[PDB]
Amino acid sequence: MELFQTADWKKVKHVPVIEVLRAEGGVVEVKVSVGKEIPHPNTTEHHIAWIELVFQPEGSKFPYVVGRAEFAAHGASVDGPNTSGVYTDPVAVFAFKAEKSGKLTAFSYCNIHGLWMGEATLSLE
Ligand SMILES: [Fe+2]
C-alpha cells in the first residue's frame, strides 16, 4: 500500500555518505564512505570498487573532479576466494584547497549492485 511510505535499508547500505571534517580558511578535508550505518559486504564475489568526488564551487559554470579512490583488495589469492586476509575498506579522504563554498557530489560503484550517488553542501565557514 503506497499510503504507507518507507525506507530501503539496501539503499542506505550502498549510498556514499559525505562528511566534511574541516574547512577553515579553504583548507578542506572530506571523508566519503559506503556502508557506514549498515555494513556492505567485502568479499571476492561482492564489494564496492571505488568512490569519486566532485566539487562545484558557487559561481562556477562547470564542476571539477576532486579525485578518485580505488579499493583493490577483496580477499582473493592463489588459494581461492576470500583466503588472502587482505580487504580494502571503502572509505576515502579527499584533501583539497577551495576559495568558495559550493556543492559536493560523490559517486560509487558496487560490482553487482550498480552505480550510486550522494550529495552535500560545503560551507567554507
Ligand atoms: Fe552491493
Curated annotation (Swiss-Prot):
Signal peptide: none annotated. Fe cation binds at residues 12, 14, 40, 46, 110, 113. One of its GO terms (molecular function) is iron ion binding. InterPro entries: Desulfoferrodoxin_Fe-bd_dom (IPR002742), Desulfoferrodoxin_Fe-bd_dom_sf (IPR036073), Desulfoferrodoxin_SOR (IPR051233). Its cofactor is Fe cation. Its EC number is 1.15.1.2. It is an enzyme of class 1 (oxidoreductase). Belongs to the desulfoferrodoxin family. Uses electrons from reduced NADP, by way of rubredoxin and an oxidoreductase, to catalyze the reduction of superoxide to hydrogen peroxide. This is Putative superoxide reductase. It comes from Archaeoglobus fulgidus (strain ATCC 49558 / DSM 4304 / JCM 9628 / NBRC 100126 / VC-16).
